[model samples]
Target: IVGGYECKAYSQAHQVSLNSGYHFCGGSLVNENWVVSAAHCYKSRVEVRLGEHNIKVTEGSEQFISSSRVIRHPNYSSYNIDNDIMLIKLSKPATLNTYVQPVALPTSCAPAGTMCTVSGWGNTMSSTADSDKLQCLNIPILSYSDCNDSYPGMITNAMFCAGYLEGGKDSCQGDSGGPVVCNGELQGVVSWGYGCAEPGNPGVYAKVCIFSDWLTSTMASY
Candidate 1:
């Protein structure tokens, strides 16, 4: 995350990468058997690693699980990045510990100006490599008008904005699918943006509260 700090928190935050130990994207454990992330990060063959702090460390607290299935939002369109959310059912359940746990999904929408924090194993440098340690940044939720003003024609109702408009902090490259939480509730998923923390271009996220029904229906059916 650009302009963020290395942190020990975000136990629910993890890596959604390759089976070959390459960190590419991020995810949040919604339950012992399920993870939620951005639809754009979908891969036919992918692995989910939980309880991760340092990507380079063995960290026994970590649990690597393969995906049993992947279900993207039915209406998700990569063409315009609309409804860009996905759920991955784990082949096996993650054993919870101090360093690994499920985070509650949002029960209601977080209004504009609510200070929320985004966490992930995303990039610290704008267009460079990913971080060795997980990073986090506290950014305020931007109003629909502010978000629309920044990106004009690209804003979707299913999407919301977070991060500073001043261009300092944001979820950058390789941080897709991570969580932006408000008071321990997972409210947003890192989706898209213009550049890494650019002025007038806040990070866009899939609004979780609005997708609760779809998520629950998908989970219950599968």
Candidate 2:
């Protein structure tokens, strides 16, 4: 996240690990047993480390749980990055605590200009610059028209753009699959972007409010 600060107050944030101590992506804790993230972040073997503050050291607040099931959106299209969401069911329920908790799904969609927070451990300078600690940036939701205009039809209804058009904010957001929270609601999932906060280019995210029924059905089915 560019122009952001190191923060640890986002209890719904999590580090999606590939192996022990390997924090590769960011995710959001939506329930005791499920994590919401970008489908592109999925792997054959996955481990979720919740309550993570620093990726370099074990903070003791962490809960490393194996996944029993991993479900990507049925209609996910990597070509256009549409329906880019996924759900990871844990082997066991995560214990709720001060540093770890679930975030409620958005009941309504966030309008353009709504201030939202993007959280995770991403590159600070668009460099493979990895910050061991969590970082967060306050960004505003951009209108669909603005996003579509910026990307020229790349921004679908499933996706929304956030950050500053002036540059210096999202291009460094290496935390794919991270959470975008609006008023404490899990509003978006970090999906993709062009460059690192370039002018007229912003961070793209999977809109979560429209997928509430899909998420609920998937969670209930399996």
Candidate 3:
């Protein structure tokens, strides 16, 4: 939420297009048919365009998933804005290819001071619309003390902080729900920022690692 802006590096944009003529944020891959992303990205209409970075469905390469469904975390309080996570269930399995590959989840865990990266096509600033090309950036995880002081109530264990406070580089508006990828594993998801790159406010993120259990259990149960 840097100065009311939301940006994500093109670290991992899976190019998922929705039926509503809009694009939704998605990751490379986690499981066979599931994609890790933000719950808010889910709408009544959408489709995944795997194997390509762009929105267009390539000839003989597009894997159209039918009977797909979006499962958002039950605790994802749209009003309170907590537990901001979700998964996409494809009716049919996606075929692996040069373009369609899943990214691995964290094998162990990332420390507080560990640095990670993200990729997405979110807006570069508050005034602009979403971008078409992918963008990526390196961001370091903040400690609880730093998170508590900078973001205060917003920085929970479920949330993490990154980017420079001086507004050098970080996620901005329209970057919500994108992946905070690191070391070929997913560390966090772009949630919100103070505004568009503020001086003292670092970019806020949804801790993907913290919700690993819930995410796996939810996917298995359903």
Model 3, 1-222: lDDT tens digits are 222222332224353433345554544457667877677666754575555443443445456664278777777866646777778777778887655667777766577777777655555553443355455667778787887788677666677787776676777654677667766788887776666667778877778877878877867887
lDDT of 2 by residue, 1-222 (tens): 777777754344544433334667788888888999889887866888887777778777878898888889999998888999999889999998777888888999989999998877777874443477777789999988889888997878899999988888782544888889999899999999887778988899999998999999988877
Tens digits of per-residue lDDT for model 1 on 122-158?
6787444348778878889999998999989898989
Displacement of the residue 114 alpha carbon in candidate 1, Å: 0.6
The parts of candidate 3 lying over 4 Å away from their true place are 1-19, 56-67, 126-130
lDDT of 3 at 25: 59
| Leading candidate by TM-score | 1
Off by over 4 Å in 1: 9-20, 126-130
How do all models score by TM-score? Answer: 0.94, 0.93, 0.81
* Candidates sorted on lDDT, descending: 1, 2, 3
